[PDB]
Every structure is written in C-alpha cells, then in structure tokens.
C-alpha cells in the first residue's frame, strides 16, 4: 500500500488512514508490468477496498483499471 | 476577454522571465544606411523583434517619457532608436528598461567603413538560434563603459535561456573587440562588431572529438564609436539584480541528498 486517497466515511478518517469497505487506496503495481502509451512504466494506481478487514483480518481490493 | 486576460498574465512579472523583446524605432532623421543596419540587427535578433516604420520625435537625453510609453505599450525591454545629425551621424541609441522605466542608455555612432549583410553574399545561419559570444579587451572587465557595452550586447543577443544545447545549432559567433588597449585620459577606442559562421574540419591531432574550426564572415561588420552614456542608480541596480530564490531548495547544514534521493543527516 502506498497511500490512502479517500475514505468514503469522512476526510478525517481519510487523513487518519482508516481502511474500511469502499476506501480508495493507492497501490504499487510494479510487478503487474503496466506500460503507458508513451513508454512509461506504471508502478502506482488506485484500488478500492471491497471487504471489512476488521472482520476478516485482511485487506482485499479491486484495482481501478 | 479570456484572451485579454491571458495577454495580461503573459505581460505581468514572473519568477523566470521571458526572452527580452527589442523594438526598433526610427527617429526624426533617418537614412538608408540606418534602415539597412537596423534590418541586419533585427534579423540577428528575430523572432524577438518588433520594428516601427514611421518617424518619431524622440530625444532620449532630453526626455524619457515617450520611450517609457513605448516600452510599456509594446512590452519591449530593449529599445534601438536610429537617428542622424550633423554632430552625431548614424546614431544608434540603445535603451534598456527596467519595470517600464529607463534603466540605462548607451549611444553609439556607426562609422562609414561598414559593409551591410547583403554585401558579403555568403550562406548564413538558420533563423532563430542562439549565437556564441566573444569579447576582446580588458576594458570589458575593468572599464565601466565597456562593462555596460558587454552586458548590453549579451542581454540583447542572448535569446532563449536553456541548459540543453544541440550541437547542430552552434552556427554563428558574434565578436566584440576593442580597437587597441587604451590609457586614462585618452579617447575611448571604437568597438568592432563582427559576425562569423563556423566551418568544422577533421583535425588529425585532436582525434575524432575536437574538430578544427574556421570562420567565414557573414556580416554585418560595424564600428561603434561610444558617443554618450547614461548609467542607472545603485538602488535600481540592486533591484534589477535581485534573485527570486523560490525555485531552489534551501541549503541546510549537515543535510545532503544522495544519488538515490534519500535525505541524509550528518552526525559529528
């Protein structure tokens, strides 16, 4: 995980870094091998957390492509 | 309205200033030789040049307001007024302005032993690339008048500022040489202005990296006699030489940035 972009509950939770369901995070995608149309290697993108880590002990997210 | 706002934003001051524009103003009395020399200088300056065509009643050493008005209206910080008189024949007055106000003025006279750009009839360089400069004379480092001349010509013909240069763009060189070293109490020697184009050849003694250079003159060749001076006030000098420092990182003791980009602190 690189950063927390937007926690949907509140900007206070966003700046505190709370990982809840629906939170937009920034992830490192270096091992995904993404290249732009201009030849730049992509190593950072956005994902949305789709579970409750407080409930199941892990963070699952969907990459926003 | 948005276009006018964009024009105002472009005109207003900024941390990294644009290339200085030069405006060529005919005076009350003008000559074909003056027009040809102005055309050659404007060709060396373009595309940072504007040229007026009509006649203007301008006396820089008697009144500054029309020049200041022209500078503020045209957003040109360099002024070249071409005039003629019996006492001053073929007079070119270079007015460099600061904040739409007169920073400094020099007044030179062009000698008759000059050849125009079309006299040589030689192949010249591409339009709009920065030249190389050469200055010959210890008065460029010691004498205030020649200091002003050197700074004015560097600022006039410097053009775009860059930190990356294509070797295919190093075409021509402008040389300003003082006609013999002088002494105090003597008349100021004339300044000789020449323009050469480079031809590179294989050297056979500098390897394949350092070619032999040769110069072919393309004109104009000019002799400037230093007629009149007008120097700025020291507070204006300091204000014009102030630096923004917004862009550069602040220096801090015992704090460095390594090759990987990590900020590092030193311990004693």
């Amino acid at each position: 995980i690189l950063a927390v972009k937007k926690n949907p509950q509140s900007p206070m939770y966003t700046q505190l870094g709370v990982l809840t369901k629906g939170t937009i995070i920034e992830v490192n995608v270096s091992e995904l091998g993404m290249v732009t149309a201009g030849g730049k290697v992509v190593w950072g993108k956005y994902a949305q957390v789709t579970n409750e880590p407080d409930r199941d002990g892990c963070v699952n997210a969907v990459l926003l492509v | 309205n948005a276009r006018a706002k964009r024009a105002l934003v472009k005109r207003e001051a900024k941390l990294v200033e644009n290339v200085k524009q030069a405006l060529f103003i005919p005076g009350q009395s003008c000559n074909k030789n003056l027009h040809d020399i102005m055309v050659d200088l404007s060709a060396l300056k373009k595309p940072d040049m504007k040229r007026f065509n009509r006649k203007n009643d301008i006396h820089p050493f008697e009144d500054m307001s029309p020049l200041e008005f022209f500078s503020e209206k045209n957003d040109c910080s360099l002024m070249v007024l071409m005039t003629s008189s019996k006492k001053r024949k073929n007079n070119m007055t270079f007015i460099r302005t600061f904040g739409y106000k007169i920073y400094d003025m020099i007044e030179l006279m062009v000698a008759d032993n000059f050849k125009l750009l079309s006299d040589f009839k030689k192949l010249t360089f591409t339009v709009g690339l920065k030249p190389m400069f050469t200055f010959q004379g210890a008065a460029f480092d010691t004498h205030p008048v020649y200091k002003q001349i050197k700074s004015l010509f560097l600022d006039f013909f410097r053009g775009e500022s860059t930190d990356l240069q294509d070797v295919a763009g190093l075409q021509h060189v402008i040389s300003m040489t003082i006609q013999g070293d002088f002494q105090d109490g003597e008349p100021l020697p004339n300044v000789l202005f020449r323009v050469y184009k480079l031809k590179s050849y294989k050297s056979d003694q500098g390897g394949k990296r350092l070619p032999r250079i040769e110069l072919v003159e393309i004109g104009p060749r000019l002799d400037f006699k230093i007629g009149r001076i007008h120097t700025p006030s020291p507070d204006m000098v300091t204000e014009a030489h102030k630096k923004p420092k917004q862009l550069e990182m602040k220096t801090k003791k015992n704090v460095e940035l390594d090759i990987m980009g990590d900020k590092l602190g030193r311990i004693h």
């Binding site: - | 010249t124 360089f125 339009v127 775009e160 070797v167 295919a168 190093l170 294989k202």
Partner: protein, 270 residues
C-alpha cells in the same frame, strides 16, 4: 473616387500577401516556433501543385532568404517510366518517394559536421510538411506526396486520417483502398467504366493511353517499375540545355520592350 488622404493613409500588406501565395500566419509558426529550446534546426517539405506539375522542395529557413536543400519535379517521371498522369495521386506518391530517396542519397543516410564529434550515428532526417494555401481534405495529393516521402525514408510526422480509405465512423483506415490509390486503381477503374459506359467520353479522356497502346491493367506494373527504378537510381541529372545563357538573354531582350530615357520622354511631351 478615392481620395489622396485615403491614398496616404493606405497600409498595404507584404508583397507575397498582395499577390497572395504565402500564408504568413502559418509561416511564422512553421519557422519561429519550437517544441523544445535546444536550438535544433528545422526543415520544411514544401509541396505545391500547378495545373500540370508537382513541386516538392526541402527548404531550410535563413535570415537572408531561405535555401533549398533538395528538390524534385514530376517532369523527371518520364525518365523513370511515367509518361502519363503527371499530376495525379500516383504521380504525387512517386514524386515524394523520389525526393525522399534523392535527399537520403545526398546525405548518405541510406547508401565534417559538428554532430559527428558527439554522436556515433547519423540522425534520421526530419522534415515538417508545408502545404501553403491548400485545403486539408481526406484523400489529397499533398498527403499522397507525404506518404511517398515517408515510404522513401524521411521522418515526416503525420497522422493517417487524411489518406484515402480512412473511415470517418471508426478511427481506422482501409489499406486496400489506400494501395489502390497508391497504384492508380481509381484511374484504371475510371478507364474501364468509361470503356463500358461511354465510348464517346473515352475518346477524349485517356486518349494518350490509346495512342501509346497502354492497357488499363498495366498501370500497376508501370508504377511498380517506376518505384523500383527510383529506388535504384535517385540521383539528379539536369536537363541538357540546347542554347546558352547569353543566347537566351539576347533572344528574350530582342522581344522585351526597351526603356525610353527621361530626355526622350521630355522631348515627346514637348
């Protein structure tokens, strides 16, 4: 009934704007505007079409008037084997290919400058297309000449939405239609269509092909052979001059009207 005050206050444009053949708004951006500030010189591939000729010139701007680096004309095409249609899409493609190959041979790029001291390999020759006063339309001979130069081996930055066969619905091209226009399939199809529809119209149109006994199915063959010959030998051979400079000058000044002197004019008035 124009007034003398109007005559004094009149402000004429530049000469090339008066006899309108130069767009200075386009020229200033082509010459004095740069993507980067590295002082890399620019070159223009000027393409012009007359009623019977095509002019392609590679020009570098210069403070004392610009200078031509290389040029090619459509009246050199009979040398390579094109004696008909010297002003069509295929002729434009051949002219672009010819000027590209000629420039490459002149520069030695494809079979002592200051760049060779710093860089190991010569750069590809980059030019910018100059069209002057022409309409940018899908399927134009100027873009045909651009395609010819690009296939010849010059780096001309371009998109492909102006070539023939570009579909306006989906951002895609029809390379079959493009190749047909390259090798003159539209001309051959018109030839067959006229021969089947109106023999009277085909009497006037395509008369030279009938005179030389050139078939409608041989246009592709002759265009291919012309391309092969141009790629084989693209060097410039100037036309032989039957007369000389002073001969032409004297013969022209024989017909030119002689100036009358001021004293002769005063005598005529008096």
């Amino acid at each position: 009934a124009k007034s003398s005050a109007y005559s004094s206050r009149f402000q004429t444009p530049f000469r090339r704007r008066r006899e309108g053949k130069t767009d200075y708004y386009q020229r200033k951006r082509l010459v004095t505007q740069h993507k980067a500030k590295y002082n890399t010189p620019k070159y223009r591939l000027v393409v012009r079409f007359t009623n019977k000729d095509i002019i392609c010139q590679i020009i570098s701007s210069t403070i004392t008037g610009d200078v031509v680096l290389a040029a090619a004309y459509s009246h050199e095409l009979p040398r390579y084997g094109i004696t008909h249609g010297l002003t069509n899409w295929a002729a434009a493609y051949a002219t672009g290919l010819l000027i590209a190959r000629r420039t490459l041979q002149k520069l030695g790029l494809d079979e002592y400058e200051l760049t060779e001291a710093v860089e190991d390999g010569p750069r590809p020759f980059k030019v910018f297309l100059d069209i002057g006063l022409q309409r940018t339309t899908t399927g134009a001979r100027v873009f045909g000449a651009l395609k010819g130069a690009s296939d010849g081996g010059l780096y001309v930055p371009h998109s492909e939405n102006r070539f023939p066969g570009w579909d306006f619905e989906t951002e895609e091209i029809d390379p079959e239609l493009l190749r047909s226009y390259i090798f003159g399939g539209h001309v051959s199809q018109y030839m067959e269509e006229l021969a089947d529809d109106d023999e009277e119209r085909f009497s006037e149109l395509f008369k030279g092909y009938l005179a030389d006994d050139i078939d409608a199915d041989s246009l592709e063959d002759i265009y291919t052979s012309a391309h092969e010959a141009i790629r084989a030998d693209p060097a410039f051979k100037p036309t032989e001059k039957k007369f000389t400079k002073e001969q032409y000058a004297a013969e022209s000044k024989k017909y030119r009207q002689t100036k009358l002197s001021k004293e002769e004019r005063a005598a005529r008035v008096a």
